[PDB]
Design a protein around this nucleic acid. Sequence first.
RNA 1: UUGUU
Length: 175
Amino acid sequence: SDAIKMFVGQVPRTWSEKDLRELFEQYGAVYEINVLRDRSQNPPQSKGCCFVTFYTRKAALEAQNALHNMKVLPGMHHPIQMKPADSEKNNAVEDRKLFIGMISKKCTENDIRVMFSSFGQIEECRILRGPDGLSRGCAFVTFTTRAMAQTAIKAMHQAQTMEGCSSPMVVKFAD
RNA sequence: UUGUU
């Protein structure tokens, strides 16, 4: 597939980029290798992990299948751990998720889904409830794209007041 | 009791 950066743990601290390139190139072409370093004192030191960026997702997956939880590098007591790097995380859920406040306590998950369905696909909708299943009068709504969440906010924030509520509905990005 | 899982 397209390029992807993988985080790799249980790499011996003595290994450099050269050693890592050699290992990974067995499975697919490597764009870049970067050993994570600690510069807190002299000299800089490997943190025992690296990033490897493969040109294709296919290569990354083949390396993962071959290595993750399978290959134990020299001196290690656990096998390589490999997964996509944090920097590759794209649609953080946290940035696509709305807090909906001041909704009626009678409001159902389905009620909220319907109210907000016109703005995009809703991947999740949860009413916050207390111990006795009573609504806390608020919800979380996750859209598939933040774009759809912004659209809902502009259209729905304080647009109406629901049954039993002291103020208009609150629609905003979740904390 | 405006309540952010």
